[PDB]
Amino acid sequence: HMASATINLSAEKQVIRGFGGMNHPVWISDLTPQQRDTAFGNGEGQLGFTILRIHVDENRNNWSKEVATARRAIELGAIVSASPWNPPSNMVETFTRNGVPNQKRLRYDKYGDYVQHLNDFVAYMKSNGVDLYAISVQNEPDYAHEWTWWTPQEMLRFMRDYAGQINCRVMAPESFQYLKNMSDPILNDPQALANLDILGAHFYGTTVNNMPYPLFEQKGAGKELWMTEVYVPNSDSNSADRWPEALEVAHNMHNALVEGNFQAYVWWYIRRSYGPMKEDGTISKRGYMMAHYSKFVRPGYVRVDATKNPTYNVYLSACKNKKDNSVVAVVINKSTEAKTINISVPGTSIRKWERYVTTGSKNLRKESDINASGTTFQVTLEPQSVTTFV
Ligand SMILES: C[C@@H](O)[C@H](N)C(=O)O
């Protein structure tokens, strides 16, 4: 009746870049001033997001719409990355893909013009007080029924021969499902790899067995790894408070961090009826799942090795603050039974953890402190809960 886990503070893994979501004031309503604070502030009742994703509009007359939310996110400590869905229409042409006509791609003779479009966006945002952390070549080049397709080889040509001219960190390829065929050619080409800064991926339908990426472990030194878009487990209307469904969000984040070694996890729309912030501006159950990571695992913390699945239905991750070697552990219990775990943290001088617990009936509730016996922290997880220990 007593499971065990070990957190090894000397086995450092990836440095955390942060957590957040998407704003898109052209497709939906912009975040309001108060919602910006709820998203990117880290007070009580705020999500503590540290990454904002925006879109690069094909029409430069829409670019000003991004500025207010991006400025406020940066002021509150976030970084901003931008992704394009289509080039300007004068750079696009059509082709027939798997027998479906009228599909879009970037004209091969416009790759330089496209570099200039992306640089123009970067310069416009810079002039408006938004120094982009990164810009992407293409959102979901491999699921572009409704936008612009790129084959692995088109992406490679761009990364190899053009991306070095972009005045920003370059993100690629943002496959819809982290399909490795989209990114392998970049990693295997020294020049394309040199021009890459961030390997970006989405997680739609990505299973745990597909989260590791051996080639990236081998070839990705100096490159960041970001999961730049998902919603899970669905986008059902008015689903954001569904319980225990919302536990799937925490589990997907656990998996990104521990199974994928991801440094960033970015939702789709921040404010939506299936998102982390509801249309009334309050945090949803799905949002509290994100918050268990985002409020506590701050940028610059480093994930460390920790028993990831100490007993059935229990999932554990741990990240260290290198300033003082303190630890943040996020523990999910999907069981209908409470679980007691002896968590060994050998070599720590820390002797007390505070904890915050979300269940179907409470949100980030501060509960009784855990007092260690030596280097062991005995914790009890309520059924169907997430706990962050700090
Ligand atoms: C076997 C099952 O009934 C068990 N007693 C439980 O904890 O739910």
mmCIF file of N, CA and C in Angstrom, residues 108 111 150-160 181-182 185:
data_model
loop_
_atom_site.group_PDB
_atom_site.id
_atom_site.type_symbol
_atom_site.label_atom_id
_atom_site.label_comp_id
_atom_site.label_asym_id
_atom_site.label_seq_id
_atom_site.Cartn_x
_atom_site.Cartn_y
_atom_site.Cartn_z
ATOM 1 N N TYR A 108 7.772 28.070 -56.034
ATOM 2 C CA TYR A 108 9.214 27.821 -55.885
ATOM 3 C C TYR A 108 10.042 29.062 -56.214
ATOM 4 N N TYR A 111 10.460 31.828 -52.878
ATOM 5 C CA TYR A 111 11.042 31.543 -51.549
ATOM 6 C C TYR A 111 11.757 32.759 -50.932
ATOM 7 N N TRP A 150 3.550 22.094 -47.448
ATOM 8 C CA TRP A 150 4.955 21.918 -47.804
ATOM 9 C C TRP A 150 5.339 20.463 -47.636
ATOM 10 N N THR A 151 5.941 19.889 -48.678
ATOM 11 C CA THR A 151 6.530 18.545 -48.570
ATOM 12 C C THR A 151 7.794 18.634 -47.713
ATOM 13 N N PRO A 152 8.241 17.498 -47.187
ATOM 14 C CA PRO A 152 9.509 17.489 -46.476
ATOM 15 C C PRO A 152 10.649 18.116 -47.272
ATOM 16 N N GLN A 153 10.685 17.882 -48.581
ATOM 17 C CA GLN A 153 11.764 18.414 -49.393
ATOM 18 C C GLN A 153 11.636 19.908 -49.658
ATOM 19 N N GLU A 154 10.406 20.411 -49.777
ATOM 20 C CA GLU A 154 10.194 21.862 -49.913
ATOM 21 C C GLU A 154 10.657 22.562 -48.630
ATOM 22 N N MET A 155 10.273 21.997 -47.490
ATOM 23 C CA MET A 155 10.695 22.516 -46.192
ATOM 24 C C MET A 155 12.222 22.492 -46.093
ATOM 25 N N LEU A 156 12.838 21.392 -46.522
ATOM 26 C CA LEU A 156 14.292 21.288 -46.485
ATOM 27 C C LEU A 156 14.947 22.360 -47.337
ATOM 28 N N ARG A 157 14.462 22.557 -48.566
ATOM 29 C CA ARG A 157 15.067 23.582 -49.426
ATOM 30 C C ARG A 157 15.005 24.956 -48.752
ATOM 31 N N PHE A 158 13.838 25.262 -48.187
ATOM 32 C CA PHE A 158 13.697 26.534 -47.498
ATOM 33 C C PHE A 158 14.678 26.646 -46.332
ATOM 34 N N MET A 159 14.714 25.628 -45.487
ATOM 35 C CA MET A 159 15.595 25.668 -44.316
ATOM 36 C C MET A 159 17.070 25.768 -44.696
ATOM 37 N N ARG A 160 17.463 25.076 -45.767
ATOM 38 C CA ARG A 160 18.861 25.006 -46.190
ATOM 39 C C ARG A 160 19.292 26.316 -46.867
ATOM 40 N N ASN A 181 9.012 12.504 -40.427
ATOM 41 C CA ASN A 181 9.358 12.703 -41.830
ATOM 42 C C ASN A 181 9.449 14.194 -42.204
ATOM 43 N N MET A 182 8.740 15.064 -41.478
ATOM 44 C CA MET A 182 8.799 16.496 -41.790
ATOM 45 C C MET A 182 10.088 17.162 -41.312
ATOM 46 N N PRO A 185 14.702 15.566 -42.554
ATOM 47 C CA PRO A 185 15.626 16.103 -43.571
ATOM 48 C C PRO A 185 16.394 17.345 -43.069
#
